[PDB]
Design a protein around this nucleic acid. Structure first.
Length: 94
DNA sequence: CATCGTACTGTTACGGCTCCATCGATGGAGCCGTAACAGCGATG
């Protein structure tokens, strides 16, 4: 049984630790749905990686466009080089 | 304005296969004409 390993020099700063702790506590409690009111440039990808690493559960991320999905996949590969990151988009060129 | 859907049709370049049109001369032998060659008698 493999585990999640995260490598990143950039430590959380500001409200990131509090948001991560709140999300982890809510997931552990068993809340069906939650919202992250993260502004642009605040590092939502870092918070997502942190909660995924803490929870240690399979994760499916849905994006509304291919470019954002590719950027998220590359970011998750960067944070998780040891771990496994996949990519499931449309293969129809036309 | 972006996203999705259980290997898609029609028309062109290019290489290999096949069918069809279009295209005298040299040596040997025989013959003719011309030049070349060979081939008993009587007297002192």
């Amino acid at each position: 049984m493999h585990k999640f390993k995260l490598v990143s020099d950039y430590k959380p700063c500001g409200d990131q630790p509090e948001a991560i702790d709140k999300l982890v506590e809510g997931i552990n409690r068993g809340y069906r749905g939650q919202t992250l009111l993260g502004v642009t440039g605040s590092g939502k990808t870092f918070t997502m990686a942190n909660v995924i690493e803490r929870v240690q559960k399979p994760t499916l991320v849905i994006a509304h466009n291919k470019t954002l999905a590719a950027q998220l996949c590359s970011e998750f590969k960067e944070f998780f080089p040891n771990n496994c990151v996949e990519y499931f988009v449309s293969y129809y060129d036309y």
